[model samples]
Target: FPVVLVINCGSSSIKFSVLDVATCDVLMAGIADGMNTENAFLSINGDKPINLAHSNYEDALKAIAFELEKRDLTDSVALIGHRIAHGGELFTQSVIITDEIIDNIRRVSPLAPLHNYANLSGIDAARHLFPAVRQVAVFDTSFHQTLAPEAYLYGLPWEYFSSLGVRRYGFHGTSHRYVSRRAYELLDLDEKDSGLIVAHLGNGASICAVRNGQSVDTSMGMTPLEGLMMGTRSGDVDFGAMAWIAKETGQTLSDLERVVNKESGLLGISGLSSDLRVLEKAWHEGHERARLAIKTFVHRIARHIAGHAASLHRLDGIIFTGGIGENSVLIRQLVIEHLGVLGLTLDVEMNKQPNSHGERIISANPSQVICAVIPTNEEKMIALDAIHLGNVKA
Candidate 1:
């Protein structure tokens, strides 16, 4: 009856899932969005959302705890897992929560303030809600800790890097590790001999090159905003261009930050919805801007994918996961086409099947590289980590 709970607390939302440790199946999942606002609501499964007008993290967690108690599943939670956004150099992998670990997380808060602080709130609330259960910290940056100096170091002044700790600490570590590990298993590739490029194409996207089962290089840099084009984040902007835009528009640093981080990407270019599904619909309807948006997205993803391949010893497989990666058939097709130099041949028939059918191989024979679609399960990965770190069986 052992189960683990995984929680991801964003600034405005709390997403959690309870997984049966033995089977790694989700027993229950819930989200409390718009936290700290009067419009907040918690919805479990597909049930109607429960109002939580102006509630904080503790109160939101209290609601979830009551739900478990009501369902008589409270006793099954043996461990709680928190998805922390940044670990800096403090942690290389998931760790059992302790006072020192908490302090370490706090120390790295300035690196990722919005995420780590919100994550701390969730961690505190989970402890308060489930007093006896042990908690684990699963960080999003830990998996990329294996990157060599050449890959992580930026071409900045040595003083800035040595003094400020300014370098590429990629995001989406959990997703990349999960998908890359799955690729090794699905393709029957030896972990020690294989290499992979995993494109985790969600609203927040990144490409990770895994050489011999560890991350060698990743697209994201220092922060999530440095990676592939995301839902709203404009990936890889020119510094001079940004300054010029500010001068021309008389914009402040905050204004530039807001526009780049929340108003750009597909939405900025398409002048349409940020959702890829919506953009795809618009593309079908002959929307010119949407067409260009999709074109840019696919191009950037393909370019990054190929570039990351340089980090691998041998390109054994290319795995796609995340919302846009697994489901956006058109995006995948176009990206593969653009990578023709890599000799990746897409099986149109195999690729056409929707991701709703789940993970599958979509590359045709004679193609040197195997292309696959693996739906990411970061929550499941976190639960597994907690189970292992807590010394729990299955």
Candidate 2:
């Protein structure tokens, strides 16, 4: 009867799933989306969405608990697994949550303020709601902790890194780890021998180089802001350009941060929207800026993958996951066009066909490097970890 409850809390939404621990089958799943907004709704198990007047994280947790109780699933949950976005170096793997772990999460808040704080809020609410259940923290930065010193270190003063904890802590780790393992499974390659490059392209995107099932390097540096061009984030901006902006516009550090994190990328370049689907539509409709934005996004991803190839000895293949990576056939084509020199070729027909059911190989047979699309399931990955850790601790 044991079930694992996985909670992935975002700034404005909470995604939850209850899964059977033994079989890893999802019993129920839902989201409390648009929290704190006028248009807030709760959707569970593909049922009709429930409209809420105004809901916060606490309200969302209560709703989830109520649904579980209503379905007679309250007593079945044995553990709760939370997705803590920024674990830093303190937690290289998932840990059973304790008071000390809670404090550590708070300590790393400065590194990922937007995510860690909200994640902690969900953790607090879950603990209060399920007083008897064990909780675990599965971190987003944990996978990239395998990066060597040379890969993680930035060219900064030693004091800044040692004292301030200023160094690269790549994210989207849960997604990357899940997909890379799935890549190995699909390709029938040994985890210890296969090398892969995984591109998690969503609103927030990053690329990871997985050597023998371990992350050696990733595109996102000290923060998520240093990765590929994202939905709104200005990825990989030059420090000199930033300084020039501050000097010319007289903007404060906070203002500059806001601009790069929220106002730039596809939205800034297109002057329209951050959503990739919308930009793609606009580009097809003869919008020059939208085309430019899409082009830049594709170019940056290809560039990073090419650069990351150096970190691997034998390239098993490249994986595309997350929202844009899985669904955007055009983007996949554009990326593959640039990777042809690496002996990667995409099958035009297979690339266009939709394959939401499972992983689909899109690479041509003659291609040396395989390319495939795998939809990421971070919640399931978290549930598996929680079940494993919970059983061990129990």
Candidate 3:
């Protein structure tokens, strides 16, 4: 079976994983962190960290290519799938990356300023390194394109909605799509009968409602910065709050944007770290602020889930994905604990344990709603797109 190498490139990092596409098994995975910094670390699957001096995205891709060669994965790699954060309207699914694709990604950079630039840099570097292989760009906004105007529109001026495209463009589309489909497969329900709510919590977080296998509602608005409380983002804060802070602190518009996008959320509220694990540790040690920060995070997630429940009218299950939602036992507990009134309750014991790839129900048997921890595999979804494209080419 041909190996599929999937790369999710971020602004300052690149995370690559090699998977056996036929069996859907991950052979190896690694990340290149702090690129363009003095001390960049390349940590491969179970391999010791390698220090690279003066490295950028291209250099990081080279290092990854070198790793593949060392592991005898180079020739087995049939295609490379990249996670492009934004596709605007031009792309609604995974597409073969060409010169035109690169130009379209650049044109939509303003929609995802931090992600598009770095994603494009990684694409350029990959193209230069493996000129003979095909590349695919899987967009995070693709699945959410199913949302109707009633669910996606904003209550802003008609001009902004008409010309500027001021409306909700949801993120985490891959994760949501993967989980909702898996929910039906696991429960032996038809796709049209499955109704689900997916909460993707990480450094960036959002809630999505999937009904009849389509995204009906999502928490993220025009940008990812508009959703649930994230590691450093003040999710769903009042717009007037920005002006208030600016006037009181004499800060510029850019300064307030930076503050809201980078310095707020759990970090700003707790006056500590943005990582949930770190905050949990502090809370365990009797830190009041850390406890409050986590409580607030769970509180907002529950509120958003409630809002989605109303949108769906009737939900079959709630799916959790992303780094925090999948791994953090404490946050998961809090999220389900406070949602009992909505006929959702967790199996306390199962909720505390770690989860693997397959879907595992975490809700009590008699609960009105089913809750499960569904591990997300965006890479597999991307690789499937590549395989489909390959068949088309053939």
Candidate 4:
């Protein structure tokens, strides 16, 4: 079947999908949730969950293999793709997993401890189970590895970047790459000459500027805590204000970090849930705090969109993706309205049909810059990379 198995291993769960390389269709999708817990289970294709009492990573993986074997797709699996979080200037693109490659991922694990550690666990399990099958590692930071020093470097000391390897390493690279490539086809634009700004707006959001088919600049920095305001992330904040808060409240750096990462953004401002659906409902109900949070999110997204435009020679299109980006009609409308300076006038009718209209242009005909809503498929992207890397031939 030339199927590619894509695995996204998180701290507590593993999400997996089998993609037919010839058609890019998911044959099977499932997840191992609550790992190493009392009630761990493998849920496949939204079916009834199968519980695994106190199962570890390997046990959870083995359970998935049992399902694959039942479906008779085990030997047909040609490649296994792992969604790696941080490559840390080590891995620039997707590569076949080798002993040295595994070591390199570990070397960069400290850059994204929570993600890489879990990813390695999945890699280890997969390697043990499928010794003969080839595996590929597709990284989140690889797409943005093309950023120039001027764009990626912070104003901090040069030693921090040179010796300490502290610099802007954007996340959601797979999403941006997939969306931008699709944009080129959907918009009929020349990839080498056109410019694009992709906004991946889920719980974790970031902006990417693609110039001549390369990521010239991006919103995310050393961590996924820069650029636009996200569901719970504060986004860009003044360091002086942080120091002042610590001085006044006597809070440690860890405490401040926790508040900014977990308590800020829409939740902190609205004093409610982090989900935009909840905030949007509140805004419609005339909730002042919720309206404020929603407005701030839109404005910050617009600001980053225009800010990233400077990196492009000729701006061609602005794409929206991810959960909020693909669904929210109100959010997309408000965002385009704030982007008037970019000559992005939303077609009110087209803007109203995001969820129903798969990938369509929502910008008015006369608008200078094109605006589109394209659904992102990171797992599909990973699968494609594995196939392109010739995992089957290897």
lDDT of each: 0.92, 0.91, 0.86, 0.92
What TM-score would each prediction reach against the true structure?
0.98, 0.94, 0.94, 0.97
Backbone clashes in model 4, listed as residue pairs:
none
- CA lDDT, candidate 1, residue 103: 96
For model 1, give the 10-residue run with minimal summed lDDT.
385-394
Residue 393's lDDT within candidate 4 is: 46
lDDT of 3 by residue, 325-381 (tens): 889888888899889897887888888777664577888888898888888878887
Report the C-alpha displacement of residue 134, candidate 1, in angstroms. 1.2
Off by over 4 Å in 2: 33-41, 45-56
lDDT of 2 by residue, 109-130 (tens): 8998888999999999999999
lDDT string for model 4 (166-225, tens) is 999999999999999999999999998999999999999999999989999999899998
lDDT of 4 at 106: 97
TM-score of 2: 0.94
Clashes of 1: 1
Cα lDDT of model 1 by residue, 96-183, tens digit: 8988999999998899988899999999999888888989999999999999999999989999788888989998999998888888
Error of 4 at 181 (Å): 0.3
Model 4 has an lDDT value of 0.92
- Candidate 1 stretches greater than 4 Å from native: 392-394
